[PDB]
Amino acid sequence: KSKLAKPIQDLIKMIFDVESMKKAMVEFEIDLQKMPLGKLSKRQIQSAYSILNEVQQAVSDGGSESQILDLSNRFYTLIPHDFGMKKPPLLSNLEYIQAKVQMLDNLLDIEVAYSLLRGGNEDGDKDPIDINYEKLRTDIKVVDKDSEEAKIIKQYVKNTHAATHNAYDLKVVEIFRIEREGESQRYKPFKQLHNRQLLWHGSRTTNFAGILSQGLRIAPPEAPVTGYMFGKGIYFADMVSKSANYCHTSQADPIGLILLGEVALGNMYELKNASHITKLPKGKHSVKGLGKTAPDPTATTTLDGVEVPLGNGISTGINDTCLLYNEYIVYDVAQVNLKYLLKLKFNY
Numbered sequence: 001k002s003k004l005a006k007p008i009q010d011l012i013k014m015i016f017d018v019e020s021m022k023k024a025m026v027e028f029e030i031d032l033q034k035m036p037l038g039k040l041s042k043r044q045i046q047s048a049y050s051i052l053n054e055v056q057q058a059v060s061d062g063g064s065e066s067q068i069l070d071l072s073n074r075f076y077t078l079i080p081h082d083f084g085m086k087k088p089p090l091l092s093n094l095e096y097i098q099a100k101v102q103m104l105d106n107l108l109d110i111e112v113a114y115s116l117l118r119g120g121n122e123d124g125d126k127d128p129i130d131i132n133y134e135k136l137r138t139d140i141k142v143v144d145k146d147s148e149e150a151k152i153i154k155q156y157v158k159n160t161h162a163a164t165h166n167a168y169d170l171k172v173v174e175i176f177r178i179e180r181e182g183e184s185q186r187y188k189p190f191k192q193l194h195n196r197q198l199l200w201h202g203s204r205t206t207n208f209a210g211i212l213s214q215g216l217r218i219a220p221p222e223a224p225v226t227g228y229m230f231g232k233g234i235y236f237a238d239m240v241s242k243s244a245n246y247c248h249t250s251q252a253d254p255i256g257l258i259l260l261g262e263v264a265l266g267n268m269y270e271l272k273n274a275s276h277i278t279k280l281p282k283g284k285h286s287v288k289g290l291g292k293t294a295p296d297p298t299a300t301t302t303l304d305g306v307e308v309p310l311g312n313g314i315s316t317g318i319n320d321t322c323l324l325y326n327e328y329i330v331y332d333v334a335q336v337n338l339k340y341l342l343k344l345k346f347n348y
């Protein structure tokens, strides 16, 4: 049996849950009878990405309906969908194409998790849980719920829930301290930057195998450029609930995982409105999209020399902005050191 503490064992089981992967696929409207979990491949997935890129361009540039039809058929022949009774939606609007891009990002992470699960179980000595754990190449510890550390994170959760995000309250079930192999080393130069902040990143549970094993990643050149409010990078929030939203929990499935990462933001190219950044201005290290509401700066604290904006949310006096709440973007994967993973209970 495993010598990993119960919470960590539970975590590993959650991350590698096969039923979760299938449910994710079903929700994406994939036909699991024609495309089962065990048939997902990296190559076939990458290919869908090019079709979506092409059809997005066609729509954007006013190509022919038949170009669009032709591309739509190719996508669906490659990735079989089940629309049940309904007629298959064509790939002729950008909102839908972006939804499909999102699906592909999730499928890739699911392929990663499934391949890891099914590989390298050769050692009959070690408990399967520990074998799977080790595949995450991440040192994980339970943070004691009655430590100053735990106390600070709990407050960050408590205080920074948004007003408009009132469908649920949020309880911290468990806090893991995590350290991905080689990440400290990768991050080390950015310790020289100022304005290092501890920020939220939410994703579906089914992404965590890829995230822990591979770190947070920036979208391929191959993926359409159209859906990203501030270009392709890694996005974080200072309001717990704006990130928690991206867990895709439900009353039916109320348990999610969310990250806190130290993010080396340096000098922030502050923005109000959409813009596809490809290069950052002179001596800027990150982007901040400014929001109408943000934690009160007067409450911000320091955890291990990283800023924790755990104040209750207040008006920022900025109105000429689209966003309701802040978000922060970096453009180099090395500018992130993940610090904690929280198991969250969404009380709807």
Ligand SMILES: C[C@@H]1c2cccc(C(N)=O)c2C(=O)N1C1CCN(C2CCCCC2)CC1
Pocket (backbone or CB within 6 Å): 098, 099, 101, 102, 200, 201, 202, 203, 226, 227, 228, 229, 235, 236, 237, 242, 243, 244, 246, 327, 328
């Ligand atoms: C931007 C926003 C954000 C802000 C702050 C924190 C987060 C976070 N995960 O915590 C997130 C987050 O996830 N966001 C998504 C980014 C990807 N798009 C999609 C657009 C179309 C192409 C596929 C991607 C949908 C919204």
